[PDB]
């Protein structure tokens, strides 16, 4: 179940190892447009929050 | 270059390099005028000596 668009939810994620190769193995995606960073170099950075 | 896609990266550094390029161009542009001023002072100093 996902939250409705009028009252959505947050989920604070911290203190792990983030791998984004598991993201592409879900479905044929409608879009993957990204603004600040690149999808290919996502697995070579460390994030504050 | 650790975070951007190779299609957008040369556009971004294209918009980044030319600012410092014109900065160095303006630096040498004032340097030529300053060198001309001290040259005009140095010819007067040589005439006085």
Contact A45, B6 (CB under 8 A): no
- What token pair was written down for B2? 């650790």
Contact B13, A47 (CB under 8 A): no
Report chain B's C-alpha Rg in angstroms.
Answer: 21
Residues of B within 8 A of A20 (CB-CB) are none
Instruction: Spell out the residues 6+ positions from residue B2 whose beta carbon is closer than 8 angstroms to its own.
Output: A41, A44, A45
* Angle at the Cα of B45 from the Cα atoms of B43 and B49, rounded to 5 degrees: 115
For chain B, positions 1-49, list CB contacts with chain A under 8 A: 2-5
DSSP letter assigned to residue A42: G
The sign of the torsion formed by the CA atoms of B26, B27, B28, B30 equals positive
Residue A37: exposure state from Cβ atoms within 10 A (0-12, 13-18, ≥19): middle
Which of B5, B6, B7, B10 is the best mutation test for A, with the most CBs of A within 10 A?
A: B5
- Please indicate the experimental technique that yielded this structure: cryo-EM
- Report d(CA B45, CA B49) in Å as an integer: 6
CA B30 from chain centre, in angstroms, equals: 8
Resolution (A): 3.8
């Amino acid at each position: 179940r996902f939250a409705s668009v009028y009252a959505w939810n947050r989920k604070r994620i911290s203190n792990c190892v983030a791998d984004y190769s598991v993201l592409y193995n879900l479905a044929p995606f409608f879009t993957f447009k990204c603004y600040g960073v690149s999808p290919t170099k996502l697995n070579d950075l460390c994030f504050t929050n | 270059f650790s975070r951007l896609d190779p299609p957008e990266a040369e556009v971004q550094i294209d918009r980044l390099i030319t600012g410092r390029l014109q900065s160095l161009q303006t630096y040498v542009t004032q340097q030529l005028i300053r060198a001309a001023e001290i040259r005009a002072s140095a010819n007067l100093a040589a005439t006085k000596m």
